[PDB]
Design a protein around this nucleic acid. Structure first.
Ligand SMILES: [Mg+2]
Ligand SMILES: [Mg+2]
Ligand SMILES: [Mg+2]
Ligand SMILES: [Mg+2]
Lengths: 727, 727
DNA sequence: GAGGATGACGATG
DNA sequence: CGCGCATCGTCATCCTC
DNA sequence: GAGGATGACGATG
DNA sequence: CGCGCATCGTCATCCTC
């Protein structure tokens, strides 16, 4: 038996015929993986091993429409390759002997998405044929995530925690050469043959040992066990949190050569990791409202003062480098474009400037130009909102061995609620609308003043239509429509997230030329739009128009978008995921944290100015001794210098200690060691002490006011400029 | 009349009905362009202007199969939008009044490809309806290529030569801010509205003024007038060459606001530019065998010593930056992967190392992994082949204001013939096979020695089959096939450029399951390949096998690839395009140029060592005067120093002049100004003079020998290592 | 058989 | 994750007459 | 009417 | 130059019963 449908199958010469139950199918993610397996099969052979590449994220068959399952080419391909039959139940040897292959070995990069791909496969097979899992039908081939070699002494690590542990355990680091393998494409064909040489260390057969697996699998992919996953993940986050505090290491898989892994083990030990990571990359943080990647871009932009405009692609490059971002430059540029966008319904306050074409309301930012043709920059408001001073309090992460972005940035206003937040993870989702900046300021000012905050209603920059609140967390958005004549009507605005094109297609054209079931509603329509505004003109029949009116134009022309924010799930500064029942809830938490961090900033300010005036004190003494002739140790032997210093009592350069030593002293008279200079210097030290005095006068809740004032003045400027430009 | 097929058409509200002959269609390259036009149409209106985006390189309808013309969705879309009918001839007002639009305005980036897109359109309309061109049916909207602004004083330039001329003409440069617009996506919507404001400066209607245009157009796109283009372009290259020598400027279009342009003007002034550029980017240079982009990557790699491996994507980044490469990072990475490839039939000598998966013989380098997962580096042989010393003689280009790669690199062996060369341009093509490196060396050694070169036969690294020469420039390549049994046969090797997959599909599977017309030839086949080698095993009928043998296995199993190199068109060091009738021809030209450049290198060596020993001479005098007490001007007033120096006669630091001043003198005694140091120094100067003496002993044709010897030793090493690794 | 359609090859849209 | 369209010149086939 | 299919939204393969 | 597949959780419709 030979398959002749799909050319991408390098079937096992023996598979299909006799002994087929002893042939395995390597399923690989991507084509290159397939090729790597092939490079590997030069060792084990081509009779008992076939190779086939998976496209990407396999379908979730557990809860998918029969149509979707059928239309799905890949699943069909797999069935065709293995000789599976949905209807047939494989509980018997005859059923087994039917299959063209004996086992299926899945190989994916030692990356969490990989765990996800494995999962989806297991879910597939499980949903479609419970019995097979028991039979030891599925196998996993694993390749090291990291390699450390030194002097022809190679050490391979298949877990990041395992490697971290090796580093924690063993000294003399910085001696070994370390290289990361973030994708099967990274390891050479040699390395591949080598892998396949040590087969036992890379082969992990999946063992069904009890019913827990059936539950565990369903826990992972059943579309009715969301809450189960919410708990399942909250547990994870919690155990993790507790492990962190205690300073305990976390347990890792694949530590040594382990023969088999239970489906339950896989799910709860490996798959859950992915899920949490998905969450971490999908759902933003209440503090900055930014997802890691966005935060990496922003951090990057901050890292370079970069006053001149920069080519997006280039910036993306530098970001990939500086921000130690590992998920490619495409997503990154996309992220940058997202950050820079400022069309109606997108961002109320864009941090990055769109110097060129970054997509319009026509196509929902999709119509944007090539990253290599467009330029960006930080907007003036950007650093105002993220004070240059605050980042002394931010905890910066050193993952990948390199200093990168913090865990969150501390904005003077809650950014989450001004640019909203949209995310899809595992067991969780996020939807937060935009809110007017002024109102935010006001409520922060109001709350700071010592008064309860005013209720806030979703606001979208440059949006003309109206937003009503039918209920708590339930709103309805309506675009503007005017009745010109009994023969003509005018659509001035559309609801948010309604794109001119999408509308033209989905709503108008169908009304223009009615479908088999219903007749046309309109006779013709003209459109005089722009990139920034919309304007349809629809001609109808006086009757049909009358009926439309009687029913409601906003309802007829689907100019009313309703949305309920019952999902507002965000990350706590501690890193835990909380779901916010109100906007004000968030606003409160933010206010609190921000205030505190103003406190800390103050402390930091006290630190600097103190180290300064103190350095000026130790500087001050030397001049007095020399001027006052109470100490003449100039040019005296260097040891005598130190000795006298330690005995004189005065401390060493304060600033170095503060950041965490005789340089200030070392500095020679240099034709400036006059008393009068002391007269100049005294002003400098006294000025430090005084600045501090004014600083002490300022309360944490008071500097905030300044920050806000500055922001607003700039803001007003910006808006003016923009409005004029529009004109 | 309204179009309801394609949603991407933003038809002109008036177009289709009455006055339609006054509505124009903006055809834009890319979607973003469309969007930009839209941003622009907020000024001119939506009644008389429709917008539709072109996919890319429009079809050449002049010589295309009816099937291709029909199947072609875009052309059909255009016809559907405008209301054209192939059969109908539009010579009459009634024919005109039929069309949904009056005029068609094409807008593309002020880039040569743009000129190409315009061309293809004109060709389309011309081929399909000669009459229309006369009617002033087609219009072009043009946007500045570069903008220079300073103090709210904007100046826009629509030609690169025009800008260059502005720079040549007007002083105080480096005062103005300059920004390049390499794509319509670069200019904002504001800038768009502004463009459309000054309509007359951007609108250029195409004027048919005589029959020359009909010839000129056909000259551009007729698939039977290749030679005509060869001449047409040789003229260009020549006029250009003459203009260059004389130091005359070149004439540019769009200089000022010019109302209309003749099709002949367009073709011969604008389109030809593109064609030559296509040639320049398509066809390599005989000297290095590298195309610009490749040369930019290589130059980049050379620019950074870069001993540690670098992530392809990253390298690509740095290349885009340093090499001032403007055509994106995709093509660039692809280029890098190409350079680094080393599978059978690819590169005999890969300059870059494939640290990871860069594609195999399975899929012709196509199966390669993601640029972000793979790493590269310069191979050890790489700089040996491009001596670090030679690049002092190379002319480096400063285009885009930044120092970039040279025009060619000077290899110790002709690289063109070792890695071959493949290109497709306009009016020209290029095909050069690979040749064995040793043989190259030998023939260079042989030619250098003073003897005529041995004939050379195409050689492909690690290729096992055989290459025969049926005639001059005509070869046939045969893979290895052995007859195991009367029931089994073995395919050991395939011809070059025959990929395991492509073969499996195109040749074997059809033989396995015969088509409606013919029956199967084989009963079954097994495959035990690797990434580096191929091995099929085919089972047949004794009869069918016998017949196959009687006919010839190599012929039956299409294991014989024939190829004729009658096209070997390359760029001369002067930059002109020459077609080489033999390989040896090339080899000769190369040898000559290389030798000469060894000469020059020698001269450069004389320059350096001379400036050195001379600097040591002027250094030497000072010590003698001080030691000899014939000059005691130490610490003497600085002017007296200079005065005495100029009067003493001895020259200033030679090295600075050589590159194209009292620093060597300035350097203080510093506790080393002893005579004995003079004793040490004298050895240093004498050593310079002696090194030179040995250098003079060496002839240009003699150092080459050294270079070659070094290369070979490394080469042998490399090959050994590789072979062992393979083992 | 001859003659016209075809397709890979590579840097581009 | 995957896929396809196009130009432009050779050159070797494959297919229809 | 209700109930199950559907699809956008966004960072990923 | 263009296009599409998939996961994962809400949430508002659209469609079939
Ligand atoms: Mg991966
Ligand atoms: Mg372009
Ligand atoms: Mg062709
Ligand atoms: Mg769904």
């Amino acid at each position: 038996n030979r398959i002749k449908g799909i050319p991408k199958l390098d079937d096992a010469n023996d598979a299909g015929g006799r002994n087929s139950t002893e042939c395995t199918l390597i399923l690989t993610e991507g084509d290159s993986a397939k090729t790597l397996a092939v490079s590997g099969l030069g060792v084990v052979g081509r009779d008992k091993y076939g190779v086939f590449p998976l496209r990407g994220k396999i379908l979730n068959v557990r809860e998918a429409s029969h149509k979707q399952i059928m239309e799905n080419a890949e699943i069909n391909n797999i069935i065709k390759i293995v000789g599976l039959q949905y209807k047939k139940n494989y509980e018997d040897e005859d059923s087994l002997k039917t299959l063209r292959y004996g086992k299926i070995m899945i190989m994916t990069d030692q990356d969490q998405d990989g765990s996800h791909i494995k999962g989806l496969l297991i879910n597939f097979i499980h949903h479609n044929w419970p019995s097979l899992l028991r039979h030891r039908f599925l196998e996993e081939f694993i390749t090291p995530i990291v390699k450390v070699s030194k002097n022809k002494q190679e050490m391979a690590f298949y877990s990041l925690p395992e490697f971290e542990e090796w580093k924690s355990s063993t000294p003399n680091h910085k001696k070994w050469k370390v290289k990361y393998y973030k994708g099967l494409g990274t390891s050479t064909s040699k390395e591949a043959k080598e892998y396949f040489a040590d087969m036992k260390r890379h082969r992990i057969q999946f063992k069904y040992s009890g019913p827990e697996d059936d539950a565990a699998i369903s826990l992972a992919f059943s579309k009715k066990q969301i809450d189960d996953r919410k708990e399942w993940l909250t547990n994870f986050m919690e155990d993790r949190r507790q492990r962190k505090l205690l300073g305990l290491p976390e347990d890792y898989l694949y530590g040594q050569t382990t023969t088999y892994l239970t489906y339950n083990d896989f799910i709860n030990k490996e798959l859950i990791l992915f899920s949490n990571s998905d969450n971490e990359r999908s759902i933003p943080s209440m503090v900055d409202g930014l997802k890691p990647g966005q935060r990496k871009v922003l951090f990057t932009c901050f890292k370079r003062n970069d006053k001149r405009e920069v080519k997006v692609a280039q910036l993306a490059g530098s970001v990939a480098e500086m921000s130690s971002y590992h998920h490619g430059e495409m997503s990154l540029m996309m992220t940058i474009i997202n950050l820079a966008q400022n069309f109606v319904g997108s961002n109320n306050l864009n941090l990055l400037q769109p110097i060129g074409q970054f997509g319009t309301r026509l196509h929902g930012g999709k119509d944007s130009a090539s990253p290599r043709y467009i330029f960006t920059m930080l907007s003036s408001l950007a650093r105002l909102l993220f004070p240059p001073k605050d980042d002394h309090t931010l905890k910066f992460l050193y993952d990948d061995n390199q200093r990168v972005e913090p865990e969150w940035y501390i904005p003077i206003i809650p950014m989450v609620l001004i640019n909203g937040a949209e995310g899809i993870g595992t067991g969780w989702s996020c939807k937060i609308p935009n809110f007017d900046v002024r109102e935010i300021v006001n409520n922060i000012r109001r709350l700071m003043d010592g008064e309860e905050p005013l209720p806030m209603l979703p606001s979208y920059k440059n949006f003309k239509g109206t937003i009503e609140e039918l209920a708590p967390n339930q709103y309805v958005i309506s675009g503007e429509v005017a009745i010109l004549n009994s023969t003509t009507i005018e659509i001035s605005e559309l609801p948010v997230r309604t794109w001119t094109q999408t509308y033209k297609e989905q709503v108008l054209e169908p009304m223009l030329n009615g479908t088999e079931k219903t007749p046309p509603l309109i006779t013709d329509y003209r459109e005089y739009h722009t990139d920034t505004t919309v304007k349809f003109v629809v001609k109808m029949t006086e009757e049909k128009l009358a009926e439309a009116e009687r029913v409601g134009l906003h309802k007829v022309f689907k100019l009313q978008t309703s949305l309920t924010c019952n999902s507002m799930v965000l990350f706590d500064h501690v890193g835990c995921l909380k779901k916010y029942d109100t906007v004000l809830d968030i606003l409160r938490d933010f206010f609190e944290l921000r205030l505190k961090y103003y406190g800390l900033r103050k402390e930091w300010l006290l630190g600097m100015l103190g180290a300064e005036s103190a350095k000026l004190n130790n500087q001050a003494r030397f001049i007095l001794e020399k001027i006052d002739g109470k100490i003449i140790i100039e040019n005296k032997p260097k040891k005598e210098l130190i000795k006298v210093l330690i005995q004189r009592g005065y401390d060493s350069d304060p600033v170095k200690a503060w950041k965490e030593t005789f340089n200030y002293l070392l500095d020679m008279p240099l034709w400036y060691l006059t008393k009068e200079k002391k007269d100049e210097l005294c002003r400098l030290r006294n000025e430090k002490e005084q600045e501090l005095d004014t600083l002490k006068r300022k309360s944490p809740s008071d500097l905030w006011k300044e920050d806000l004032a500055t922001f607003i003045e700039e803001l007003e400027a910006v808006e003016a400029k923009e409005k004029q430009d529009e004109q």
